[PDB]
Homo-oligomer: 115 residues x 4
């Protein structure tokens, strides 16, 4: 599993559960084509978005549906979502963990990339 | 005046100077349309993006061109850009300041909305 | 003027107003001595902490009283305070701005050092 | 294992390996008594700092020796360390994960607390 997404709630101090995540990949025509999607588990993690075969070189966008999450908790947040845009596998195949830490008016995202 | 963007560099401990910033507004045809842009000053700030007349309710996207910034410093970056997607809502007099703190493999963004 | 502290609230999307800030300087006896303190203004900023004459090289600790801030808003916090411990080093004319972005269970701090 | 510490490098996009971590607990006399210490693994994680028996209610300080880490990488950073101060087990025994994301002039820390 070369791509994992983790989401944390900075208000509750907990994993962010049931958060919708959409991954897009830039196509030839410069448009964003749907690549994969899922929901975070009880651990705030989303595995199994892709396989080494499908996860080719390209420009990817990971959209984390933060607004829906905060709205489900009765909170009216600032952002529509958190978006992480990056080139992958540009220098050989790696494993990417994309993490987002969420607050109503802020988010922090990081990437851990291991060979 | 209703919209300001500020960018900080977590590696150098300084404002992020000369960073390109592009703002888009979601059109009725569900597509992103260029709205405003510029480059951050020596203070890491970009003022004069828009006016009260032009800055109506709607969905906006701020793209901060982080990859080019890091490239210019000779530091290896992960993200193509930092993106901040938000709904502007009228609720009395509001100024929006969108701030981003940049590291090569991470960023933190916050919104400060004041009357 | 050589030291400024700024505090932001990631839950309300606003400056963190009236937050207590205590600064200490490490003494030769290896203990922390009160150096400067105050409360953040309506802009979330605390100016006038010290002067160029008083702000010599040394090791400093800035404690931002986050627990009391959250308590005053009725929000359940994790940290007793946010702490930022740093060495002040002379290297031409420097102003240090220490910024903290607060959530109930998280904080992000950065230093911006300008000439 | 009721206390785990994780450290990530925002410059390299990797776990922060071999980082020294010291945990203190506030004693009766209001002084910081040594509680536990360790080093992060190849995964940037530090388990086994304590046991449910030893990890009683109290005010704890987790000091992450960030300066030594950045210095070992040839980098001269801003902070002496990152410090996380919190009351634990004030409302029954929990499991605490304290995470820090490190850059030369900035750090972000969060807590995930699970029952
Ligand atoms: C009324 O208050 C304002 O207009 C605040 C605008 N400034 C900011 O949001 C800001 C935000 C940060 C900041 C951003 C992200 C983060 F993770 C930590 C920060 F301190 C740092 C500085 I120095 C800032 O000036
Ligand atoms: C080898 O190490 C990994 O697989 C890293 C995957 N995890 C993360 O990136 C991670 C990241 C954070 C984190 C994210 C944003 C931020 F501002 C601070 C953080 F600690 C917290 C936790 I708890 C995590 O596990």
């Amino acid at each position: 599993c070369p791509l994992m997404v983790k989401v944390l709630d900075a208000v509750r101090g907990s994993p962010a559960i049931n958060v919708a995540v959409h991954v897009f990949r830039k196509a030839a025509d410069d448009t964003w084509e749907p690549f994969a999607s899922g929901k975070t588990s009880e651990s705030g993690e989303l595995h199994g978005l892709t396989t080494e075969e499908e996860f080719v070189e390209g420009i990817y966008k990971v959209e984390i549906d933060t607004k829906s999450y905060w709205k489900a908790l009765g909170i009216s947040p600032f952002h529509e979502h958190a978006e992480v845009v990056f080139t992958a596998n540009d220098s050989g195949p790696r494993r990417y963990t994309i993490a987002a830490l969420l607050s109503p008016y802020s988010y922090s995202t990081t990437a851990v990339v291991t060979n």
